[PDB]
Amino acid sequence: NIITVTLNMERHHFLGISIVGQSNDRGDGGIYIGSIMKGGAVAADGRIEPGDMLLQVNDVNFENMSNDDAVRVLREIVSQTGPISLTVAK
Ligand SMILES: CC1=C(CC(=O)O)c2cc(F)ccc2/C1=C\c1ccc([S@@](C)=O)cc1
């Protein structure tokens, strides 16, 4: 079940979701949500929970990107201004 959530970065300063990259023999393990930090934008939503997979983040797609690279691009968005839309795979 793919769900897209729009986090408000006006009142929230951090998302509160530690990204965990899944590493294996191949490498396309993808990035998943580790833990949610109370006080973050994600904790204000509720649809995202530990174990959710990040697919698309503000138009950008991480499904065919490296785990590390996904976080690289993600950091550019997370350290920017504007609404952050997270597309998770539950
Ligand atoms: C909690 C958390 C957030 C969201 C937030 O709380 O605002 C986040 C955003 C990013 F763009 C990158 C990393 C993180 C993070 C925890 C963590 C995950 C991976 C790394 S390594 C893969 O660089 C380090 C730390």
Side-chain angles (χ1 to χ4, degrees):
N1 188 3
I2 299 174
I3 306 181
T4 330
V5 304
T6 315
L7 306 175
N8 173 275
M9 284 302 293
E10 303 309 285
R11 169 181 168 190
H12 302 105
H13 281 234
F14 60 100
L15 313 178
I17 36 157
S18 60
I19 321 298
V20 188
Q22 192 170 214
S23 327
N24 210 39
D25 277 288
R26 290 286 178 103
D28 54 286
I31 47 168
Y32 289 77
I33 302 297
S35 307
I36 303 174
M37 322 304 171
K38 186 63 173 68
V42 177
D45 190 90
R47 282 170 293 189
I48 304 181
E49 68 198 89
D52 282 344
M53 182 181 177
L54 278 171
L55 312 172
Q56 187 167 145
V57 180
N58 279 87
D59 282 292
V60 319
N61 180 35
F62 294 143
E63 286 184 79
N64 200 24
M65 290 188 70
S66 333
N67 294 335
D68 284 68
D69 220 45
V71 178
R72 289 180 185 141
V73 176
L74 179 69
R75 266 190 166 126
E76 284 318 292
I77 311 166
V78 173
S79 318
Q80 224 61 212
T81 343
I84 293 176
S85 298
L86 297 175
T87 325
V88 295
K90 311 174 67 66

